[PDB]
Design a protein around this ligand. Sequence first.
Ligand SMILES: *[C@@H]1O[C@H](CO)[C@@H](O)[C@H](O)[C@H]1NC(C)=O
Ligand SMILES: *[C@@H]1O[C@H](CO)[C@@H](O)[C@H](O)[C@H]1NC(C)=O
Ligand SMILES: *[C@@H]1O[C@H](CO)[C@@H](O)[C@H](O)[C@H]1NC(C)=O
Ligand SMILES: *[C@@H]1O[C@H](CO)[C@@H](O)[C@H](O)[C@H]1NC(C)=O
Ligand SMILES: *[C@@H]1O[C@H](CO)[C@@H](O)[C@H](O)[C@H]1NC(C)=O
Ligand SMILES: *[C@@H]1O[C@H](CO)[C@@H](O)[C@H](O)[C@H]1NC(C)=O
Lengths: 446, 446, 446
Amino acid sequence: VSIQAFASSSTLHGISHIFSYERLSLKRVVWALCFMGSLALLALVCTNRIQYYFLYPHVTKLDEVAATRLTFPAVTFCNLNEFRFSRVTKNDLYHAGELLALLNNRYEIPDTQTADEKQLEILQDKANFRNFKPKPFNMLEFYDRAGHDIREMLLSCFFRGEQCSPEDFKVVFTRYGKCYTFNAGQDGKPRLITMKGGTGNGLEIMLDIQQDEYLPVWGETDETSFEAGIKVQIHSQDEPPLIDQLGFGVAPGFQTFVSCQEQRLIYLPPPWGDCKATTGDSEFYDTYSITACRIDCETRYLVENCNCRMVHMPGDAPYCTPEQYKECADPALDFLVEKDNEYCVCEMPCNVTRYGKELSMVKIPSKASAKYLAKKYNKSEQYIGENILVLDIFFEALNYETIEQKKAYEVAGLLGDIGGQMGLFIGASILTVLELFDYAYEVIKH
Amino acid sequence: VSIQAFASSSTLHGISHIFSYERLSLKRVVWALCFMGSLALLALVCTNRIQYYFLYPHVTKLDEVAATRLTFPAVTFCNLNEFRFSRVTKNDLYHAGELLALLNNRYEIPDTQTADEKQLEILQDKANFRNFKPKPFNMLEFYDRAGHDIREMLLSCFFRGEQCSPEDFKVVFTRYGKCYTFNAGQDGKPRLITMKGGTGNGLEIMLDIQQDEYLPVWGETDETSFEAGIKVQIHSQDEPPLIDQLGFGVAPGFQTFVSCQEQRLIYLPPPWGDCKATTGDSEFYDTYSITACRIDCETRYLVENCNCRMVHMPGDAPYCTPEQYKECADPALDFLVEKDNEYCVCEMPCNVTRYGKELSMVKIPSKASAKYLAKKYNKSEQYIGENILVLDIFFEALNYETIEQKKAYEVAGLLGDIGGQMGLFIGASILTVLELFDYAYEVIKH
Amino acid sequence: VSIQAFASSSTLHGISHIFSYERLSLKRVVWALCFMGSLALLALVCTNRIQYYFLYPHVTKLDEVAATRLTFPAVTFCNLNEFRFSRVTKNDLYHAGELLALLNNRYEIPDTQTADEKQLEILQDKANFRNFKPKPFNMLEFYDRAGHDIREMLLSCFFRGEQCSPEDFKVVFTRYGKCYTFNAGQDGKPRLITMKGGTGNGLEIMLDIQQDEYLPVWGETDETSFEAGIKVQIHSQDEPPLIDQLGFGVAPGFQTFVSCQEQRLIYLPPPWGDCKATTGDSEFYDTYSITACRIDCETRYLVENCNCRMVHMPGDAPYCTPEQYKECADPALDFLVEKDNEYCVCEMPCNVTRYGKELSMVKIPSKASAKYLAKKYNKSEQYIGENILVLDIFFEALNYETIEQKKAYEVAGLLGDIGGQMGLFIGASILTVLELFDYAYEVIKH
Ligand SMILES: *[C@@H]1O[C@H](CO)[C@@H](O)[C@H](O)[C@H]1NC(C)=O
Ligand SMILES: *[C@@H]1O[C@H](CO)[C@@H](O)[C@H](O)[C@H]1NC(C)=O
Ligand SMILES: *[C@@H]1O[C@H](CO)[C@@H](O)[C@H](O)[C@H]1NC(C)=O
Ligand SMILES: *[C@@H]1O[C@H](CO)[C@@H](O)[C@H](O)[C@H]1NC(C)=O
Ligand SMILES: *[C@@H]1O[C@H](CO)[C@@H](O)[C@H](O)[C@H]1NC(C)=O
Ligand SMILES: *[C@@H]1O[C@H](CO)[C@@H](O)[C@H](O)[C@H]1NC(C)=O
């Protein structure tokens, strides 16, 4: 009814003394100042937590979960040479000879300074082109044959002390050519596990990089490979190999323990964080990752721009000849990487498992095992120090760190800190706001 | 008294207009819907924060505390050979000859291919067993004598620029045998400190791995050691050495700065996190850690299963002969590691100090110091490149990172977000719930 | 007016039934116990969150921001020799000969054991001092000339596949002498960027450490340098080089991919955390960092204590002669580092960008490129393996991790959890406390 009658019976805390049934005194203004200030101190502090929730913040919980049976990560490796030298042929030097950086522009040799007599004359019968009847070419078939064969390289593999197999090593194709993948987990093979830490309860391979089978550099080229040794990218079984980008290396003559530490990272979907919220099954890979998007970003580009695919690409498109490489494929990489890089962006999913690495090198061989390794694989003693390496990937302990992001302020924490200060300053509620609306609805009709 | 009389004078916000002293109108149901909804919106949002507190969550605070006098971590190392070759004896080849992988099953030699004439005939008088009167054996005494002696290996140790001592190096026993521990901190010696970073204000040892004193491999065995170089585990002084598991290595001929970074990790006790809440003094180590539990997990097993202890074990039990090794001890490791691994689990304590490591190799020696290092220790020039290494462990700066876990939601934050939304939705309290009980207690008696 | 009249009309929840207009019964004490307990349960729980806010806590948010154009960090390097041997002179051996550890106390040679005939006689005409007319000396001018020249060392630099320049390498001065800085960003040059990851889209230098130009060690000195190879500190362009402290190394004959990962760390100002809150422009560096404070901590010390500055110091003070080095400068370092270390402390600012590093070594050269690298730079084959190295610094992917510290409890979260439990326990507000003061103000006047 009356304003002095309504304010004497409502649930607000200040109006019972402002609008009292008494004359105007000094107490009415000290209740007016202390209510109009405590309504303004509620106003700029409640709008803090509203705008703080509107940022959608999140802080991270780290934890070290202990386990017993961890999975082994897919040890993916290949030699830093593209392909062997004794497995190239005269027909191989015709369709793809200029691209392999041993030929000039007119399908002839560059300057033959610092070329051995036995090294040049094995190449010299390959570059006759006299009554040359060519054969049909395929760049995938060239990387199948001329690449480094697994049954020649790997002297002794191991896993958890048990023996290994070159049939367990699964071929892939990257920018370095014929690359293999231990513990791939595809083709129905279950991913192997580990039950202990230490240097013996992981992979232990003993490779042979075949330094005599490297491409002899005679002319200064753009992409000559001076180094010897392999390159390794450690990843989960879902992510395709990206050895060209995410790969470290080990040296020959250096047994290299690479201690991993399994991490299980969990991000948040928008609007909290940035992850691929759904699964997002890509067109040429059954699962999604940060790399499987990136090769699918490049595969659909080179099909729509050059009507073929490279040898390191998934799908079923036919492989580009070196006629398509020197004219279409290579000018279309830098046209996307440099110019149109903002047209394609991959959102990393928020269930990702990574593997750190802590390097440590030990020199192989000792002199006590020097003469033993020479005869046991029919090699010279000078051959052993610069061809034979050992890699060793394991886990420190059976535990994995998790890096998960907790939402720092949900809507249930906002309601606890709106009325946590709404009740502190004026004592109202959602019903008191509806109560003040229910009195003002009666005043406007009278 | 009456329901219209009680609701007109209570502290709830909605019942003053639902149960008014007026006829049934459209305002009674719009106060009934807006109260039965604001009682249900309180119901499913307060049960969010109750169940969120019942998970006992925690998020982590990272901080980089700066300091002046950091402690130096216990640099623990041993050569990757088990024991020397010139310090084995005919009696040593009888009681423990087959276990050291130089003998066949009938206490005879394996195939002697790739064996030098001077290397075989020093072994050939050890394996006579003709009128052989044996001596009493002890596997701890064999690892005391035949192991790599510290006064022969370490050419020059240093610490903070000041000189060092082989008497400061303290012997332990691991799976590799005679291992030493710089800055052990036990036997009343105070743990040394550092007052600066950089490569000169830490340890700088110059070892000599004695590659001529390695075990010559002639037959293909299960545990032949091809590599040369040492293995190092960095740890705090409390934790016992676990070089077999938590150890990295450095190579010979390679001065290897190993930059540490001191971390002081703090976890939470249950039910927040998982730590050993109390101290938990183990039976054979004065302090508790993740490793001291694990060796105590293995020591009590092999005493209860084989009535002895291994050479890398604490306590006072007598050491197992190789008769007990080939028949009891080795079959009881894999019976616990593979089968009964779930019977024993070590809870890592929540006051743990760790040390990261960032490797970096520099080749030693230069040609300017090549001929100097040859004569100054009476060594050949070919000996220097493959025997002499330098390790260098220090800190980057005088600061330690801390990784501590804050309890993200205590009971004082739950009470602020129960009544933070209880006062927002219905305006009640704990006393209003007691007030509604105090009116309903009067109704049931009338 | 009356206490039974005031409590029947106030906004507290308990006083309406304690001070009722009825005789003393059992309900008055059960409302007295349940109010004096719910006033005490508010008391010790509200003082929890008050003292929890008074600690000013903070928890950290980790995030992995993806980007396209990252900046390249300033690759700062220098050879581990101080200066060349063929660029020292007779006058250079007079003013500074004893300090370079080739002379005795009486300006004569130490013991010449293990000294070559061609190596001693090139030094022997430098140490005549017979009718010696000296030249004016400057230690900055000695480190300009006698140091390792960039145009002799760097065989081939690269960046993003494009060519490089020795004019892009900018000289600085550290404890190792003549040090250079790729991508320095000073002198108006804009800091270069990267648009891709992988081993080819970063720096790729091919140095030549000039192992024939090292100082030949003949006598056992305090600071002889046995090792060969360079030292590298990766940092942002703002921070001055601190290669002596924050530097890792790479070896010769070892192509060493050093995979970075850009981090953008953000701390908090006091009283939350510890950072330099303002900019804090130092006296001799235009920007502030943790290192630029430390050299400014040492520059103002040695000017106020020795009236000069060292060669690795900023400013405009004249450089100290070796007369000032052996008598003033060296005794004033350890007088500050060991004794007065607590007089100077640098507060690290809270906008700091760091760069991690993940090492990986690959052996260079292969035998296929062995004879090519010998003639192409007019070097012997034995020279190539122990002088030629390659360093390679890049990024894994175009993304940077951020480690920022969120204030875990602001004043708006305190007010939500004071009245969140003030409204829960007694239902009061800030006005009810003023209401109880407004009744007690009337009682004391009557
Ligand atoms: C991510 O993993 C969590 C368990 O760690 C699971 O509950 C969730 O469903 C997963 N999400 C996706 C999209 O795979
Ligand atoms: C070992 O290699 C040599 C060539 O160096 C060859 O003549 C010999 O037949 C090989 N022996 C075996 C058993 O492979
Ligand atoms: C752990 O360390 C903290 C200080 O960092 C100390 O207050 C606490 O008592 C310690 N707890 C145990 C169980 O040692
Ligand atoms: C140095 O070693 C040789 C053996 O190579 C030995 O004959 C000689 O006596 C040794 N000299 C010293 C001083 O130890
Ligand atoms: C620090 O960086 C943030 C952006 O990352 C910026 O908003 C802030 O002003 C910076 N503060 C200082 C002192 O440079
Ligand atoms: C190459 O070096 C030799 C000395 O080893 C020198 O005699 C010759 O003139 C040099 N040639 C060139 C082209 O620099």
